[PDB]
Design a protein around this nucleic acid. Structure first.
Lengths: 394, 200
RNA sequence: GCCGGCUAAGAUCAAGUGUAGUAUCUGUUCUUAUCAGUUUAAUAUCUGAUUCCUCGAGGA
């Protein structure tokens, strides 16, 4: 029932027919060797980019993932590919790899080969040992004995394809095409080499691309080579609106009412504002304290009747009530043009309620103000609030 | 409640043409003036009328109490060029530790003397690459500025586009940040060439 | 410092801040192991070599 909490963690997902992210590597549909390598490497919890890319690579569809530096994109490209190679074994033909990994640098290709050897440890699968600027005879002797994956340079791959040392057959040769640092491969320098690498490939083969940054033109150039791609970045799915300004202040539980009274008294946050509370009795007490302080305020919660809540909503929409106290039920789905300010005095336990409270004000391209009071008790939601502020650009 | 430990002094009567700077000089003659910790602007107030008119009264708070008792027996009944001032303990009727410790350290007795901040980078670029690329020099300068901003506050950054060795100067506010940038830039690769860093 | 101990007794490696100078803070790690060489007043440091048990996993 907590499938929405994995998507709210902050992982923009785009595409049709996207599988659910896995919580751990033990229930991700991986083989025994990949799980043994993950247990030997010391991975207790998987990365969110890895949890978004591993079912997309296990399902057999094209995926394009973007994340920060050092997030584990090489392991996220090597582990489901090795799991699909171990689960669906094929005949190791001559001079034909089952996977093609493209790296723009020789040191990056050597690091990808070392990561693939560490992910395929305690097994007979040796992928590749080749780099640019070295002896081609040793690389040909290493590739002639058997090659599972092909992680090298595009120039070395073009030289191997021109000298008939390595190529992709038409019927069944490779099933996955990995592209590490796809922003550099889609540039003007590596365009015809990547075009000749993608042209001489099998028709029934998946294409994977991973990079730290991704421009619009590079993504538009890379989307033409894939067939129905699935995008995975951060953050978009269940994220806060960028048009509404978010503000977080560190105050106590008793000082929150004084901060709200100072924002209503000194600043212009009293009129046309929606105040989110934790419970209905606390919202009624805050509404009574606002009405006792010579300020017109209305309240809408589950403890009140439906007609009184409708009258309070009509008074907030018409302009009769300056402030409107509401619970978490009115945070999502409410589309009021008068709600310009969103005062979150009580922080919710879930980030989706805070995202719905921030998105309730300043919609349809308009600006908005959102001020939330962060306390010491909401320490678990502070990381989610920081991730939402980093995704929204606040 | 606080009877003494009052570091505020009240200057009864002043020339109606008193500026703030002459007043803070008068007050700094008798010790260090406490500064508002969040900001600059020493804690000195010139009391004013309903208008620009100068009532002629002044308030000044001091770091210590001995400076108050100094101003009491040296400024009271003493004439500035025209007028007769009066000095009295101020009457009141109706972040923190960081700057407190700094103002305290303004009274130190630490050893002076000693020696009594520019990093030079070489082998970073070439003039031949800027002849057919007018946007490569600005991108290299922006990359050098983004590299120098992570080590400290860069006050001045220049790049010699006509030097055959690729000379660049990065002047920061502190020599420790320049030494850290020279330690992090020595032996590093930039644009396929090994660039070197030295002090100035 | 308290009544031999509760790891505030030391070294170190990366980054930040800042001074004319000294410095200040965070992550750390700390070999729990042996032998040979360097070295140290002695440590230190550096330079190299070195299957069993438990419930596919962990420890040695």
């Amino acid at each position: 029932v907590n499938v929405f909490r994995l998507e709210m963690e902050g992982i923009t997902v785009k595409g049709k027919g996207c599988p659910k992210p896995i919580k751990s590597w033990v229930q991700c549909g991986i083989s025994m060797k990949i799980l043994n390598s993950l247990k030997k490497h010391g991975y207790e919890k998987p990365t969110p980019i890895q949890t978004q890319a591993i079912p997309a690579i296990m399902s057999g569809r094209d995926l394009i993932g973007i994340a920060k530096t050092g997030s584990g994109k090489t392991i996220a490209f090597l582990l489901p590919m090795f799991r699909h190679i171990m689960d669906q074994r094929s005949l190791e033909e001559g001079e034909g790899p089952i996977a093609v990994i493209m790296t723009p640098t020789r040191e990056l290709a050597l690091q990808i080969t070392k990561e693939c050897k560490k992910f395929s440890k305690t097994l007979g699968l040796r992928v590749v040992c080749v780099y640019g600027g070295t002896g081609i005879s040793e690389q040909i002797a290493e590739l002639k004995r058997g090659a599972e994956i092909i992680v090298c340079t595009p120039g070395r791959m073009i030289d191997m394809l021109a000298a008939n040392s390595g190529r992709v057959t038409n019927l069944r040769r490779v099933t996955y095409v990995v592209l590490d640092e796809a922003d550099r491969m889609f540039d003007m320098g590596f365009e015809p080499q990547v075009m000749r690498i993608v042209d001489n490939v099998r028709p029934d083969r998946q294409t994977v691309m991973f990079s730290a940054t991704f421009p619009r033109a590079m993504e538009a150039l890379a989307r033409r080579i894939l067939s129905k791609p699935i995008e995975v970045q951060v953050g978009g799915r269940s994220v806060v609106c960028s048009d509404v300004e978010q503000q977080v202040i560190v105050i106590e539980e008793e000082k929150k009412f004084l901060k709200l009274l100072e924002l209503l008294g000194h600043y212009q946050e009293s009129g046309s504002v929606i105040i989110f509370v934790d419970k209905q009795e606390h919202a009624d007490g805050l509404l009574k304290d606002l009405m006792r302080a010579s300020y017109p305020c209305m309240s809408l919660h589950g403890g009140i009747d439906q007609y009184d809540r409708d009258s309070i909503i009509n008074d907030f929409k018409n302009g009769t009530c300056k402030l409107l106290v509401a619970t978490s039920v009115a945070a999502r789905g409410l589309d009021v043009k008068h709600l310009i300010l969103v005062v979150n005095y009580s922080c919710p336990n879930h980030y989706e309620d805070y995202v719905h409270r921030a998105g309730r004000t300043g919609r349809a391209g308009n600006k908005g103000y959102a001020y939330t009071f962060i306390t010491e008790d909401q320490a678990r939601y502070a990381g989610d609030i920081i991730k939402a502020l980093e995704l929204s650009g606040t | 409640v606080e009877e003494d430990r009052n570091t505020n002094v009240y200057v009864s009567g002043l020339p109606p043409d008193i500026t703030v700077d002459e007043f803070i000089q008068l007050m700094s003659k008798f010790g260090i003036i406490m500064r508002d910790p969040q900001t600059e602007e020493f804690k000195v107030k010139l009391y004013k009328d309903n208008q620009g008119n100068l009532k002629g009264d002044g308030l000044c708070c001091y770091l210590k109490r001995e400076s108050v008792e100094l101003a009491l027996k040296l400024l009271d009944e003493d004439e500035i060029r025209g007028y007769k001032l009066h000095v009295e303990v101020a009457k009141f009727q109706l972040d923190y530790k960081k700057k407190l410790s700094m103002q305290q350290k303004q009274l130190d007795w630490r050893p002076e003397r000693r020696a009594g901040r520019v990093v030079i980078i070489k082998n970073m670029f070439h003039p031949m690459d800027f002849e057919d690329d007018p946007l490569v020099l600005n991108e290299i300068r922006e990359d050098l500025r983004v590299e120098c901003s992570k080590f400290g506050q860069i006050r001045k950054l220049l790049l010699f586009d006509r030097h055959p060795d690729g000379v660049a100067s990065v002047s920061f506010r502190d020599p420790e940040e320049a030494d850290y940038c020279i330690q992090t830039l020595d032996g590093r690769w930039f644009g396929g060439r090994q660039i070197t860093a030295q002090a100035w």
